[PDB]
Curated annotation (Swiss-Prot), chain B:
This is Small ribosomal subunit protein uS11. Part of the 30S ribosomal subunit. Interacts with proteins S7 and S18. Binds to IF-3. The lineage of its organism: Bacteria, Bacillati, Actinomycetota, Actinomycetes, Mycobacteriales. One of its GO terms (cellular component) is ribonucleoprotein complex. The chain holds residues 22 to 138 of 138 of the full protein. One of its GO terms (biological process) is translation. Residues 98-117 are annotated as: Disordered. It comes from the Bacteria. Belongs to the universal ribosomal protein uS11 family. GO terms for molecular function: rRNA binding; structural constituent of ribosome. Keywords: Ribonucleoprotein, Ribosomal protein, RNA-binding, rRNA-binding. It comes from Mycolicibacterium smegmatis (strain ATCC 700084 / mc(2)155). Located on the platform of the 30S subunit, it bridges several disparate RNA helices of the 16S rRNA. Forms part of the Shine-Dalgarno cleft in the 70S ribosome.
Curated annotation (Swiss-Prot), chain C:
This is Small ribosomal subunit protein uS7. One of the primary rRNA binding proteins, it binds directly to 16S rRNA where it nucleates assembly of the head domain of the 30S subunit. Is located at the subunit interface close to the decoding center, probably blocks exit of the E-site tRNA. One of its GO terms (molecular function) is structural constituent of ribosome. Coiled coil: none annotated. It comes from the Bacteria. Belongs to the universal ribosomal protein uS7 family. SUPFAM superfamilies: Ribosomal protein S7. Pfam families: Ribosomal_S7 (PF00177). GO terms for biological process: translation.
Curated annotation (Swiss-Prot), chain D:
Belongs to the bacterial ribosomal protein bS18 family. This is Small ribosomal subunit protein bS18B. The chain holds residues 16 to 79 of 84 of the full protein. Signal peptide: none annotated. The keyword RNA-binding applies. It comes from the Bacteria. GO terms for molecular function: small ribosomal subunit rRNA binding; structural constituent of ribosome. Part of the 30S ribosomal subunit. Forms a tight heterodimer with protein bS6. One of its GO terms (cellular component) is cytosolic small ribosomal subunit. Binds as a heterodimer with protein bS6 to the central domain of the 16S rRNA, where it helps stabilize the platform of the 30S subunit. One of its GO terms (biological process) is translation. It comes from Mycolicibacterium smegmatis (strain ATCC 700084 / mc(2)155) (Mycobacterium smegmatis).
Length: 32, 117, 156, 64, 100
RNA sequence: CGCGGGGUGGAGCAGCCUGGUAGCUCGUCGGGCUCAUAACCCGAAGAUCGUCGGUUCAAAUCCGGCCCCCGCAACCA
RNA sequence: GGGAGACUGGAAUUCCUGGUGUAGCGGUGGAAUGCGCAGAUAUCAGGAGGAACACCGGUGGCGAAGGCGGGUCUCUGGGCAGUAACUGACGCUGAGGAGCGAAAGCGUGGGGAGCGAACAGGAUUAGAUACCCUGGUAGUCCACGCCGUAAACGGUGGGUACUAGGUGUGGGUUUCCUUGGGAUCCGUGCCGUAGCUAACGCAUUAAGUACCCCGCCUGGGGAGUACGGCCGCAAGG
């Protein structure tokens, strides 16, 4: 179809990836 | 210095210039002529007129060591192959062969990927 | 009349006093506007002063100066890809006569004699010997053409 | 070309890696292998010619 | 940077003077090539049970030749903002595009 | 302490050991290039040898100093 | 070019030693960092080492899908046709389940030529944390395992029967002229009726006409995210 749907989805995915970069450490230690 | 009865040319026509050595059968080079050494620099170095002046100066420095007959060996893709052969046949050396020895890899080392400009 | 092809040009009558295409064409390029009669008085008076300083036929002196300023190659202008390329091009006959007469008139007009007649006389004489600034502009135009020979290939 | 073959049409002929004449009928003046369109092979014998020329290059019988 | 501010059919509030000065002043920042600016402020749509269409025209003699630039908007500040965004991109292009 | 080399358009660099013929590179404006910008390209505007001294036709050039410049490597100065 | 193991081949790039030989080479839209003048680029001879396999080779073959092309040898998997010798419905699908599964990435040990994220400098630009240039580490390679994801796409689950044709090409049987056509079974493309579709299109390799089993959907965001559990060395799934 259009690539707009694909790109909205991918924006969400990207943002999430970044959010796991920055909290990586914090999730390990707060979880442990 | 010495005399050489006949030699072979080497023309490296790689886009930004042509480097024209001449060489005996042995392969030693009596003299080497290039567009850059003529006086052109930069993008003017790429031009076929730079190849004509490179083969002119290469044929004069060639003729100072007494070469008369030449077998021409031209390299791969670029501007200035038949122009350098032309300036050689006019500038004091005669035709001989025109051998297109392009160095062909056969999917060898992977080439640089793509220039997007 | 460009973009439709070549346009037909006006035929030019020759000179009454001297009998040349090139004298009348020098008059029409002397013509700072309005006064063709005064342009004829400048050209005629300047060529009889050339007759005084040569003692010969003035149109032979004129055509020898015209030959000694006449260019063979002109530079121009085509900018291939983000760089301005001075491209040398073969000059037509009419284009070469036009550059010869136009340079002759303009650089006579820069010269520092009192009237215009003495200016044009001294410029036709100095261009006949080869000592005017206009001959130096021919040598500078061939300097730009021979200095820029490589870019000429485009075949343009 | 636009023939149908010589091996599939003449219906008896063996392609032999020792035989340097038959393999040099199908390489070019450069030494490179000609196509199936240029020589008109059936596909089986185009595979066997290509492998046979390639073996003959491996044992120095063709100028690579 | 000489800045002429004409109406077209409109009052010219001290808010409009100051805002004009600061948007257009962005251009003084980074395009040193500027000379004269001429800025003229139309006002229609008004009177018709509808919302007034403003229009801004801006003229700019650079150091060299003459830009022009025209914008229509429901209000005046939003229009002059938009006009300065456009002008900034253009000029650096007329800055751009060159450099061999 | 010396023996040396070391000076030449604003500058850097030669040339200066075998006298007649001082170049060279950025600081130079004007062009052509583009509808343009700039570059790219062309040309142009400055030293006759830090300077002064003898001989030889001819002297930066050869020889005497100096202003200098130092390299240092020495100094139980 | 189905897979695995083993041995080996040449062209090319890079470095190395040695010749020949001089001031540029490289690079670009134009340049500059860069390598040079200590002997580079160029050319000739020899050596090392690694990776990828020009030509054949394409709308072509094989594999369940990923995927598979230098050669040879060794071990092994599937398919197709022909005869009909045998068995006699042993078929189909398949929730959960186990296995395989590009690239990137991960662990331990090797290897490291070319290419090359990150990382520098140069340039461009208002500014480039970018494109373009010069260099460049992990990686790319092999051995042994992890991981489980893709536009893993024919964007089309698997099986079966039927429904006008025309023309290419791949594998094999046969009747006729005597390689040429015919007919047939299996494959893969291009065009085309009927029928179907929202339309584009599909169209005997169906998205047509029907039957069997599975997966899955129920407005857009929030979100394939939280919480919880499972797997994983981690990234994460």
């Amino acid at each position: 179809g259009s690539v707009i749907k694909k790109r909205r989805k991918r924006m969400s995915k990207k943002k999430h990836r970044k959010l796991l970069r920055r909290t990586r450490v914090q999730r390990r230690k707060l979880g442990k | 210095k010495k005399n050489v009865p006949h030699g072979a040319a080497h023309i490296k026509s790689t886009f930004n210039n042509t480097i024209v050595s001449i060489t005996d059968p042995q392969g030693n080079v009596i003299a080497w002529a290039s567009s850059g050494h003529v006086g052109f620099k930069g993008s003017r170095k790429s031009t076929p007129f730079a190849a004509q002046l490179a083969a002119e100066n290469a044929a004069r420095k060639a003729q100072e060591h007494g070469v008369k007959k030449v077998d021409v060996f031209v390299k791969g893709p670029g501007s200035g192959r038949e122009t350098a052969i032309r300036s050689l046949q006019a500038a004091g050396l005669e035709v001989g062969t025109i051998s297109d020895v392009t160095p062909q890899p056969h999917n060898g080392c992977r080439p640089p990927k793509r220039r997007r400009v | 009349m460009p973009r439709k092809g070549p346009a037909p040009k006006r035929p030019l009558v020759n000179d009454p006093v001297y009998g040349s295409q090139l004298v009348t064409q020098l008059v029409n390029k002397v013509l700072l506007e309005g006064k063709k009669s005064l342009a004829e008085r400048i050209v005629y008076g300047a060529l009889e002063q050339a007759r005084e300083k040569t003692g010969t036929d003035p149109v032979v002196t004129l055509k020898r100066a015209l030959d000694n300023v006449k260019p063979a190659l002109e530079v121009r202008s085509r900018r291939v890809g983000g760089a301005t390329y001075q491209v040398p091009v073969e000059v037509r006959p009419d284009r070469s006569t036009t550059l010869a007469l136009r340079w002759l008139v303009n650089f006579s007009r820069q010269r520092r004699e009192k009237t215009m007649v003495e200016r044009l006389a001294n410029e036709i004489l100095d261009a006949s010997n080869g000592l005017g600034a206009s001959v130096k502009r021919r040598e500078d135009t061939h300097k730009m053409a021979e200095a820029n020979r490589a870019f000429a290939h485009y075949r343009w | 070309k636009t023939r149908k073959c010589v091996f599939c049409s003449k219906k008896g002929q063996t392609i032999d890696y020792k035989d340097t004449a038959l393999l040099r009928t199908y390489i070019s003046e450069r030494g490179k292998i000609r196509a199936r369109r240029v020589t008109g092979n059936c596909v089986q014998h185009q595979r066997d010619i290509a492998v046979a020329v390639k073996n003959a290059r491996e044992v120095a019988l063709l100028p690579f | 940077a000489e800045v002429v501010v004409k109406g077209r059919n409109v009052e010219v509030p001290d808010h409009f003077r100051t805002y004009v000065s600061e948007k257009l002043s962005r251009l003084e920042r980074f395009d040193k090539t500027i000379y004269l600016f001429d800025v003229e402020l139309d006002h229609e749509r008004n009177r018709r049970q509808r919302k007034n269409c403003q229009h801004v025209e801006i003229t700019a003699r650079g150091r060299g030749p003459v830009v022009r630039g025209e914008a229509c908007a429901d209000s005046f500040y939003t229009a002059f903002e938009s006009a300065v965004q456009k002008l900034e991109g253009r000029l650096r292009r007329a800055k751009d595009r060159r450099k061999i």
